[PDB]
């Protein structure tokens, strides 16, 4: 199996943010498995690979756009299919960046839940 951490990056502020601003770090370790696939989980998945999606604030209901950073996407080993569903795969024993996607976003002060699905893959 895999041991997964999802760690919030500190000192994120409301208002206009930097493009590709870091909001979380995903850590995936295994002693048995060489790779893993990762997808974001939400009501609004905005690309074919579930690597960009939208999350709603708890108190205001406002949406932000979140996903894997460009550099993290580029470190991908492959895009595989599981029951016809696209999963991007990465090397185990590595970390990835979760970021505010696209051009600079104006983030309303709130708490936003971020949920990731991770699975083991053998090439």
């Amino acid at each position: 199996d895999l041991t997964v951490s999802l760690i919030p990056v500190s000192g994120l502020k409301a208002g206009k943010n930097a493009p590709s601003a870091k909001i979380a770090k995903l850590v995936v370790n295994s002693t048995t498995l060489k790779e893993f696939g990762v997808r974001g989980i939400s009501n609004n998945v905005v690309d074919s690979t579930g690597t960009a999606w939208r999350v709603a604030g708890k108190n205001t209901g406002k949406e932000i756009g979140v996903g894997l950073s460009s550099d993290s996407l580029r470190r991908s080993d492959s895009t595989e299919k599981w029951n016809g569903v696209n999963w991007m795969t990465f090397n185990s024993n590595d970390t990835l960046d979760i970021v505010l996607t696209g051009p600079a976003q104006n983030v309303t002060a709130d708490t936003y839940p971020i949920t990731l699905d991770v699975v083991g893959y053998q090439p």
Binding site: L6, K13, G37, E80, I114, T115, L116, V119, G120
Partner: peptide, 19 residues
């Protein structure tokens, strides 16, 4: 290659944008 269904984990955290 192939996926390992039993190894699948959902994981979530709260991110906070503060004034």
């Amino acid at each position: 290659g192939s996926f390992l269904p039993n190894s699948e984990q959902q994981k979530s955290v709260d991110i906070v944008a503060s004034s």
